[PDB]
Design a protein around this ligand. Structure first.
Ligand SMILES: Nc1ncnc2c1ncn2[C@@H]1O[C@H](COP(=O)(O)OP(=O)(O)OP(=O)(O)O)[C@@H](O)[C@H]1O
Ligand SMILES: Nc1ncnc2c1ncn2[C@@H]1O[C@H](COP(=O)(O)OP(=O)(O)OP(=O)(O)O)[C@@H](O)[C@H]1O
Ligand SMILES: COCCOCCOCCOc1ccc(C(C)(C)CC(C)(C)C)cc1
Ligand SMILES: [Mg+2]
Lengths: 50, 526, 170, 487, 364, 140
């Protein structure tokens, strides 16, 4: 009865940290994709120069 | 009229406007009006004004009916809605549009009162439940949280809090009334309708209203609803009247804000939320306060609801909210499944501030029960089936938790005496299961007047107007003590001799079932 | 009124209260008086004991809570919540006149058991009740004893010896 | 002379861009816009430049009813706030505007909030213990006068109560000007605190006051929370440099200053860090911390609270804030669930002054043992929760019976939590704490039960609690006797 | 009257962008293109405008051999589906084109698919009980009309015989038809279910049939699977309103409907918030569930299977699915190994309507 | 070198403000070349070059006794040895709180003098057995 409580507590910590890790990998990827596009953002710039 | 521009693009709820050739200024956080059809007009909110006059917008109504070529008008005005006593007894889209069933424009977004306008809470708020008004007091201003996993008893507590106030508000003056508001973020439209019919059954709707934003409704509207209910509360607050406010639920609001922030490619944060989600709740919850006598001594209570998962308070939103609230009520699915309903966990719950406002009749008793449960939670945990004991603490605890098992709101007078009996050991001869029927036999029925024992003078339970004397004097006064003790001593001797001996005498299985139906019926009516 | 009242923060308040007592006395529905208090606290004019005592007089003389009736309205709990507001919330304490209005209301309401409690609550605070009221209280108690109305009729009805969810009236 | 004027370019939340035609001002300069258009006054500090003839900026008050082409006035200086004795017993906003409704503050000069930290030559780390009266704080993590203090703990653990207990013990018993910065916390707490101070004559308005209050709370946008502690430090630095007087800096709490910069860096276009915080976390925190340093002129004993979302110390903000502190106080939630308050986890806690050179020897040799014993008890919790007490050697269950006594003895009731615990608050002196722990450590008190150490202060109170428990046990034995004889 | 025309401008997988020259059509609008160019029919649902003349749209069939700037027809509305007695005993894809080979379908009208959920007035707060015919379910887990129901059961536990009994009982007891919605359904299980529905006389091809079948399969792109439950739900709402009777709307594992819409949102460029599901999880799900509610005019029940990924209820898709449910009909292989059929474990199961305020007291 | 994690945090604060792409744990990615450029300069020069040298004792903060993070792993990958300071031993009473089983040095006898060789050669063999037996509660 005590081992089961420790087990479910570990199953929760494992299954929660697995989710936080998946989300973190998404944040890293989207951060790189958003940084590339934001820096590589292209515009017409139809303004006078002379 | 104005025609600032036209809808360039749409991404679900969020949209983007491009400006007209005759470029004109638009302010920030203004409501806009999209000419969807010849007569139908949507409503939408600004969130950024860019260099080229291009504008970002959040849509709120009729998103399915929008196109690109449509026109866009500006009101030059904040996001306002109607408000007043006439709005009471109605159920509305957050934007003021009433929904059917079978002048004064207040602002949605507003700053909270400063430290000088505010005040430490002084008056109580009766939830009707014995657990709360006893151990976890709630004052008119104490924005208190209601945690618990899905299907635990959260949505019913705020209802019972309102139903308890209906019996009283009819009697007392209008100034000390407790109006109410029930904001439903993401809850099913069926639940909202069932609640409407419920509150109309007890006639509690005249002193209430509902703000509906279901999951079928847009997300940007769910982001906005509790600000609208808070505005309806702010009006009665600033007018000196007290009020309640409820959020069912913020955990479904944060998802709706996460939709918009991620649809706009804002940088996420912990657990996918943007990072300003704390400020979302602060703008809301800091509007809850007991205003100062300088400003009318009004009030605006807030009973949010938040959905945990597997009883884990270490989640992001739950702690962002606990860092705001002046309290906490932690419901556990362990006890809700284990028959105990409501499923309050007293160790993980607290009322940080209501004790300053808890009535002295409930205060001197609450300190005794707090001591009692403080001892029960150790005397029950240390043994863990190691060695039973027959002691007044472990007895009175089990006798009291049954009384805490409740279905609906209990009157204040009906709430106290059932606990007063337990703390003073009167309710120790009876058994566990017969404590509920004991209670119903004490409150609605009067065994002494029935059995002729009228040695008491005035103290009886048949009137229920005696509450407002207990509310002023306290049971520990010199005059209410003896009549109380003799009334309970008689009621106990009668219960133990006339009834309980018969209950122990019954052996027919059909009789036991006929008895358990009565006990569960006392479990319901009480 | 040379003495000056202050708030908990130390701000000054205005004791100019007479006009509000006049607006209370003109009212003929005792909920409008509570709305006058609502129009009083907003102007930084917290209530004086004269004000609450006028309100209790107003409830005693008023015919109803509003132009239309309301379910279960009681002049008593309405006259006792405001006393709780006096004592605990605001700090002002009532006087003999204050409780005297409550005992008057219990006499007019016909209730007697609550009357004796108002007597003992009065005396325990050193207040001298008027015997002209308590005598009529005992008179109504003697009548209700004679008519058997000392208690309700539904309590003296014998209980079901057999247990049944319906026979118990639940 | 003329005041430069510019025009707005774009608006995104609190963030704004401005086009100054002739030239741009420096960084941190203020920009006022009239209350005519928006409806209320509004100051906007510059933080960065996008291109020439341009400047991005953050707004203090709300950006509502703000258009794209409004005029923007330049102050020609940073955010200036008043200083002096007139700031005593008064409440202020981020801009130095008062909100207490008392009257016009009679300032003489106004200093800026953004200021470079002191130089290495000025600093002076002097080690002097700070008697809080609290027991665990004295024993394990003794505070240091002139240093910094950190109260790390999640939501609902008891750090704001630790601060109120420290005010009631230290502040009134200080004789030095104090400053209290509310940075994203409950407005209610600031009201309770201004009343608790107005009751003890610390903010006696018609006489001499010894405190200052700044409050940019959660209701405010992040533009204020990100710049309030700077203002409070300006009020403290004036007393530190000019008056040359010891002061206190209570901060509740810096995590909302960090959230404010996090909610800002997103809007400015800055790419964020791992969890989502700003990339400038260490710098923005250091420019706040390193201004808190004890010079020769004066000294600043700061007491900062910190939030830990999800009870997660791996959060970069507290994880960065440990380094800047002289005395950490790591609170926990599992301990508070066990009834103990304060919910300190002394194995996590730490300090700098904990050396024999600064504090007396007995305090050090005692605390070093106390940490050691709890370190063993933690190792045994993994087994006792599996097997139980009975499955251990006599040495181990002894050490458990002694460490349960110690950990229960670490609790005590505070005068602030009388509403909660319903017990009078104790003030445990330093010398009696060390004599008690040393006696408990050498087995001088082993026959005494476990519960006698719970929520008490001083061993004499323990032995009186044990006397009450033994008396009640004997009384229940006589009562069960008579109940059996009559039965 | 004429019909609008547009031209493609870019193609990225199933995602497509269509330029017009006039007022763009609405959102959720259908766009069909003839089969001569692509070789087969093709439908695309508009989702995301991009300018005054562009419209990004999800493709429902395979977009292979689709050329650029091809003609694109606007149907004048959103996706139309048949309804009527002819629907019964037949199988339909998303577009309403039968894949059963059993001749054409003689439908009368063709309703749209994205009908808005009922107004608050159309709802009926009175919570009733569906007299199911199964004493285990009627007693311990009363299926509330208008309600959402959960079903946990793998193989060898009679998961099909239950839903077949529920259809056969509702066909005669309450006088109502039913419908099955196979979202992401294994194509083999479609055959094993349709052959059982011919072996059990649930579909009397030479007589009267009770259930409709809607199979959005795994071999179809996620642009279709996200619109399958709305299709069957329209087939049910027609029988709710016009015929005025109770209905069952069975659903495959809702996790596959959530995975479908999550892939759609990911394809469109929208950031996934959480573990990998879309940010529109609760709203996309709610648009489905809120159409499933009792009414004054009738009722729609929704039995729903669920696959709990890694047995973690804390995952967003199960927990968000649980928030709408009213009952949880668990099945266990243990009792089925004990010969029990239906293989219900009443203890671990639960219901929302276990309250005498709703139902008779003695039942409780 | 004091905390090198702070030397990477500053590199992150700069690159991300410079609109460089992040990587693992928000770093630019080339931080390994940062610490390699730093540490491989540490060396013992040949007698041709004066036989000088410079030792590096870089310090790296750790959170919850993990060596799994990005920076800690990129640094241990480079450095010869490592001196693991376990809080469980620090709080265990003993100071300096080195854990010998986790801490190593990839030089060995060739560094220390003639006298310490013969001692440490016995101490390693001693601890190899004591670490195996010290887990036993002393009963003999
Ligand atoms: N005080 C109570 N006594 C007995 N049963 C109760 C009580 N409160 C709620 N219940 C039971 O709980 C169920 C409803 O749960 P509830 O509505 O509180 O969940 P909820 O918080 O609304 O969940 P969600 O927020 O996800 O909709 C009903 O079966 C109801 O009978
Ligand atoms: N001595 C004590 N006795 C009883 N309770 C205490 C004691 N000390 C602290 N607590 C508890 O601490 C809690 C208050 O927590 P606190 O106010 O410190 O959180 P907080 O710092 O406001 O959280 P946040 O930083 O998120 O705002 C209450 O539950 C209170 O009962
Ligand atoms: C009072 O009314 C309550 C009715 O509530 C309806 C929803 O019930 C929620 C039940 O949800 C669960 C949660 C977990 C599980 C388990 C853990 C048994 C599922 C499992 C084994 C597949 C992981 C089953 C059902
Ligand atoms: Mg706090």
């Amino acid at each position: 009865g005590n081992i089961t409580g420790l087990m479910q507590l570990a199953d929760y910590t494992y299954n929660k940290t697995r989710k936080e890790l998946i989300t973190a990998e998404l944040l890293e990827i989207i951060g790189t994709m958003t940084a590339m596009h934001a820096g590589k953002k292209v515009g017409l710039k139809k303004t006078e120069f002379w | 009229k104005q025609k600032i521009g036209f809808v360039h693009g749409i991404d679900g709820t969020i949209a983007t406007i491009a400006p007209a050739a005759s470029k004109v200024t638009v302010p920030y956080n203004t409501v806009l009006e999209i000419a969807v059809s010849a007569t139908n007009i949507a409503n939408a909110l600004v969130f950024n004004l860019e260099k080229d006059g291009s504008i970002g917008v959040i849509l709120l109504d009729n998103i399915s009916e929008v196109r690109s070529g449509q026109d866009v008008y500006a009101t030059g005005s904040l996001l306002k809605i109607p408000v007043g006593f006439h709005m009471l007894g109605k159920i509305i889209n957050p934007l003021g549009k009433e929904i059917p069933t079978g002048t004064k424009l207040g602002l949605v977004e507003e700053m909270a009162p400063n430290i000088v306008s505010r005040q430490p809470v002084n008056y109580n708020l009766l939830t009707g439940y014995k657990v709360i008004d006893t151990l976890i007091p709630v004052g008119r201003g104490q924005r208190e949280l209601i945690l618990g996993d899905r299907q635990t008893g959260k949505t019913s507590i705020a209802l019972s809090t309102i139903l308890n106030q209906t019996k009283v508000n009819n009697e007392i003056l209008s100034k000390n009334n407790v109006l109410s508001v029930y904001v439903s973020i993401g809850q099913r439209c069926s639940n909202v309708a069932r609640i409407h019919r419920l509150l109309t059954e007890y006639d509690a709707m005249k002193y209430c209203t509902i703000v509906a934003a279901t999951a079928a409704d847009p997300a940007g509207l769910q982001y906005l609803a509790p600000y609208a209910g808070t505005t309806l509360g702010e009006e009665f607050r600033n007018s000196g009247r007290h009020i309640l406010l409820v959020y069912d639920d913020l955990s479904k609001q944060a998802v709706s804000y996460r939709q918009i922030s991620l649809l706009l490619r804002r940088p996420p944060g912990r657990e996918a939320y943007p990072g300003d989600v704390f400020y979302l709740h602060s703008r809301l919850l800091e509007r809850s306060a007991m205003m100062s006598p300088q400003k009318g001594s009004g009030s605006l209570t807030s009973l949010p609801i938040v959905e945990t998962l597997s009883n884990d308070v270490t989640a992001y939103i739950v702690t962002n909210v606990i860092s705001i609230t002046d309290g906490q009520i932690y419901l556990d699915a362990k006890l809700f499944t284990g028959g105990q309903r409501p499923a309050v966990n007293i160790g993980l719950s607290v009322s940080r501030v209501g004790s300053s406002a808890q009535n002295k009749a409930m205060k001197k008793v609450g300190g005794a029960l707090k001591m009692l449960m403080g001892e029960y939670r150790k005397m029950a945990g240390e043994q863990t089936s190691g060695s039973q004991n027959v002691s007044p603490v472990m007895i009175r605890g089990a006798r009291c938790l049954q009384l805490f098992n409740q279905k609906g709101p209990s009157y204040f007078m009906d709430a106290i005496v059932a606990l007063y009996a337990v703390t003073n050991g009167y309710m120790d001869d009876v058994k566990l299961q017969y404590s509920k029927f004991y209670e119903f036999l004490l409150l609605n029925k009067d065994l002494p007047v029935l059995y002729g024992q009228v040695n008491n003078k005035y103290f009886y339970m048949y009137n229920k107007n005696l509450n407002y004397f207990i509310r002023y004097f306290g049971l520990n006064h010199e005059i209410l003590e003896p009549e109380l003790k003799k009334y309970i001593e008689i009621h106990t001797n009668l219960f133990l001799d006339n009834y309980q001996s018969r209950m122990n005498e019954l052996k027919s299985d059909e009789d036991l079932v006929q008895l358990k139906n009565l006990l569960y019926a006392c479990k319901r009516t009480v | 009124a040379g003495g000056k009242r202050y708030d908990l923060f130390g701000y000054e308040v205005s004791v100019a209260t007479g006009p509000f007592i006049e607006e209370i006395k003109k009212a003929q529905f005792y909920d409008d008086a509570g709305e006058v208090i609502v129009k009083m606290n907003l102007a930084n004019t917290p209530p004086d004991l004269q004000t609450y005592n006028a309100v209790l007089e107003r409830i005693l003389n008023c015919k109803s809570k509003r132009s239309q009736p309301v379910k279960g309205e009681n002049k008593f709990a309405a006259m006792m919540d405001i006393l709780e507001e006096m004592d605990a919330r605001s700090g002002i304490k009532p006087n003999a006149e204050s409780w005297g209005y409550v005992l008057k209301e219990l006499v007019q309401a016909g209730d007697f058991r609550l009357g004796w409690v108002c007597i003992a609550g009065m005396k325990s605070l050193g207040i001298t009740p008027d015997q002209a009221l308590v005598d009529a209280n005992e008179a109504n108690a003697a009548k209700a004893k004679a008519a058997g109305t000392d208690f309700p009729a539904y309590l003296k009805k014998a209980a079901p010896e057999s247990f049944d969810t319906k026979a118990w009236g639940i | 002379d003329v005041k430069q004027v510019g025009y707005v370019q774009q608006i995104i939340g609190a963030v704004v861009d401005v086009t100054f035609t002739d030239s741009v001002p420096p960084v941190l300069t203020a920009l006022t816009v009239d209350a005519k258009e928006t409806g209320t006054l509004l100051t906007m500090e510059i933080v960065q430049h996008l291109d020439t003839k341009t400047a991005r900026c953050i707004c203090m008050s709300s950006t509502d009813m703000l258009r794209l082409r409004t005029p923007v006035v330049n102050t020609g200086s940073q955010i200036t706030v008043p200083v002096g004795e007139a700031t005593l017993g008064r409440i202020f906003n981020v801009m130095g505007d008062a909100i207490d409704q008392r009257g016009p503050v009679k300032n003489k000069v106004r200093w800026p909030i953004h200021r470079k930290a002191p130089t290495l030559a000025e600093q002076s780390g002097k080690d002097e213990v700070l008697v809080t009266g609290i027991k665990v704080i004295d024993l394990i993590l003794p505070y240091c006068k002139g240093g910094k203090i950190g109260l790390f703990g999640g939501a609902g653990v008891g750090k704001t109560v630790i601060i109120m207990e420290l005010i009631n013990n230290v502040a009134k018993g200080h004789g030095g000007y104090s400053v209290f910065a509310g940075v994203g916390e409950r407005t209610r707490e600031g009201t309770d605190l201004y009343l608790e101070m107005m009751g003890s004559k610390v903010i006696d308005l018609q006489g001499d006051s010894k405190c200052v209050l700044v409050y940019g709370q959660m209701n405010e946008p992040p533009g204020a929370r990100a710049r309030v502690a700077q203002t409070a430090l300006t009020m403290a630095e004036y007393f530190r440099d000019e008056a040359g007087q010891d002061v206190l800096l209570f901060v509740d709490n810096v995590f909302r200053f960090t959230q404010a910069n996090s909610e800002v860096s997103a809007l400015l276009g800055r790419i964020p860090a791992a969890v989502g915080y700003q990339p400038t976390l260490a710098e923005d925190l250091g420019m706040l911390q390193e201004r808190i340093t004890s010079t020769v002129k004066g000294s600043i004993t700061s007491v900062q609270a910190v939030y830990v979302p999800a009870d997660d110390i791996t959060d970069p903000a507290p994880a960065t804030t440990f380094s800047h502190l002289d005395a950490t106080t790591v609170l926990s939630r599992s301990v508070a669930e066990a009834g103990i308050y304060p919910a300190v986890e002394p194995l996590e806690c730490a300090s700098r002054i904990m050396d024999p050179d600064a504090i007396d020897v007995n305090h050090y040799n005692v605390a070093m043992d106390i940490v050691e014993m709890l370190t063993k008890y933690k190792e045994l919790q993994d087994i006792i929760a599996v097997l139980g007490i009975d499955e251990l050697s006599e040495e181990d269950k002894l050490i458990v019976d002694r460490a349960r006594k110690v950990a229960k003895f670490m609790s005590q009731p505070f005068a602030v939590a009388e509403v909660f615990t319903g017990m009078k608050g104790y003030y445990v002196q330093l010398e009696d704490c060390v004599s008690d722990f040393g006696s408990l450590l050498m087995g001088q008190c082993d026959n005494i039960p476990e519960m006698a150490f719970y929520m008490v202060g001083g061993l004499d109170s323990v032995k009186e609690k044990a006397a009450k428990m033994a008396a009640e046990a004997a009384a229940m034995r006589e009562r069960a006797r008579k109940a059996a004889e009559a039965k």
